[PDB]
Amino acid sequence: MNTEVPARNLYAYIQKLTQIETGENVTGMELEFKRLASSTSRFISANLPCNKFKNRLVNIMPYESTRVCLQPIRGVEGSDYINASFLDGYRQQKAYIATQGPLAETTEDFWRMLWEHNSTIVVMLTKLREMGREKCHQYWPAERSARYQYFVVDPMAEYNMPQYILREFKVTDARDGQSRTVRQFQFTDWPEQGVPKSGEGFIDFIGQVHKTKEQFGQDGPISVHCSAGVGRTGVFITLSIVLERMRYEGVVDIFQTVKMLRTQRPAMVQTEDQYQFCYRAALEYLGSFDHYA
Amino acid sequence: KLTGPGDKDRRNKRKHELLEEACRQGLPFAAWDGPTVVSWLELWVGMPAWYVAACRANVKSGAIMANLSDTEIQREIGISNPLHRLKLRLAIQEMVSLTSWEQILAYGDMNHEWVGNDWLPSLGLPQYRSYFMESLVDARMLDHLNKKELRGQLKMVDSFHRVSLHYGIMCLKRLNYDRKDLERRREESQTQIRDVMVWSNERVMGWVSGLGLKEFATNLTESGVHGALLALDETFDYSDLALLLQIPTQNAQARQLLEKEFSNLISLGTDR
């Protein structure tokens, strides 16, 4: 079934998905989202008893073929493991790392991950705590310098923007004194239930993050995390790819994009609501161009 | 590809016309209002959105902007990075001078993206691209970079790589920072031994290949070897080059050939 739609047909296509017709109980949207299910590598490192506490959810683990590996540490089994996956982007290979919100116990691993893989832009898609539950451990220092194993992380500055906060850090490898600047963009406008009422804030945020990568010439992957690193993180990466492809090629294929992401990390874009929001936001972005409104 | 106007282009065009009106109308920088300096900081200086937002909240005039101390720039604009502060200082000073358009409102012809994507790779120094761009180093800043910033923030520990930058900058100066002239002169020296001072690292590799030393040319990738170095550094000789080309001492014919061709290159294409 063709799910690739030219821009000018996107309004009509979405309307047809919202509708239910020809003798089925469910909407076209729900049918399409369920069709993603039928669509793979293995979970090896993630299932080692030495690594079980490193996973936020037992049923969300990286595929072996795309997992982000750490350099092993002498005598510590499992030290090469973090729950994180590479995903390709529109223009570059390994454009993203999708990962869970760090645990207290994987916080040192998280910083080593950013270091070993030259990730200097991090995207946080949750608050620390939501609905009475920890979503993410606070892995960054508040006011003074902090040491996470080999790395000294020094808070440089904090900027409050309308729908996000940017935190800048200097991270130093205490072993040899090398240092990099790391930037964290935390989106602060995702509701604790459901999806944003409008996609405009999230679209602008996507734009700002990628503008930053371009302007500062940062070639490494953007590390993106939410709770488990598949739901909101799936939305961020889906829309990052789909919005740029729509702008340069004038077509949208959200179904095949999510399918593609799920070949690189399981369960990307986890709920129908999130899936529907991808369409909704793409249509909103399309409307910022007069000849397609 | 999506065609036509839109929300973003309207917003940008309106920001630009604040800038173009102050400039063309001969309004000195000190007399610029808030929205104008904010537009200027975004479009002409090229600062990230968070500095721009800080400026909008805390800096209501060009006069204010012009008289900020270093510690006040850090506080009112939020600029921690010493090289980002350098960028602003030089930008302000340039703007004050020009407002007291011929000044190119096609800003960014030699901004930090040109330095990063175009110029540093042409010097055989593409491995420094990310550090220069993260410090927003534009052409205007290059001659002002002090030894501490080069060593630390810009990660240029290698003394040869720093010498390579130096002669790259000397070339820019001699060309009066005329990007078009640099490009023209590289195009008109592609196929002859002429104007070696302007040659890219790629062109130098092309020259080595043309000698019959093609299997060694690739070794000059990230070496910092470029024409302005060959033309302006009197200490750089054929044996220095042979080493960077990684020609084995056993390949004596290749080394003799390089010696003779290098002599020819300097004699015919430089003033050494």
Author numbering:
A (entry chain A): 1212 to 1250, 1254 to 1507
B (entry chain B): 807 to 906, 943 to 1114
Pull text from the paper.
Type IIa receptor protein tyrosine phosphatases (IIa RPTPs) function as presynaptic organizers. The vertebrate IIa RPTP family consists of three members, PTPδ, PTPσ, and LAR, which share the same domain architecture with a large N-terminal extracellular domain, a single transmembrane segment, and a cytoplasmic domain. The membrane-proximal phosphatase domain (D1) is catalytically active, whereas the membrane-distal one (D2) is inactive.
Here, we present the crystal structure of the complex between PTPδ D2 and the tSAM domain of Liprin-α3. The final model was refined at 1.91 Å resolution with Rfree of 0.208. The pseudoactive site of PTPδ D2 retains the catalytic cysteine residue (Cys1440). However, the tyrosine residue in the phosphorylated Tyr recognition loop and the aspartate residue in the WPD motif, which are critical for the phosphatase activity, are replaced with Leu and Glu, respectively. The interface between Liprin-α3 and PTPδ D2 is located on the opposite side of the pseudoactive site. The D2 domain of PTPδ interacts with αN, SAM1, and SAM2 of Liprin-α3 but not with SAM3 in the present crystal structure of the PTPδ D2–Liprin-α3 tSAM complex. At the interface with SAM2, Phe1430 of PTPδ hydrophobically interacts with Leu978 of Liprin-α3, whereas Arg1397 and Asp1433 of PTPδ form hydrogen bonds with Glu976 and Arg971 of Liprin-α3, respectively. Taken together, the SAM1 and SAM2 interfaces are critical for the binding between PTPδ D2 and Liprin-α3 tSAM, whereas the αN interface contributes little to the binding.
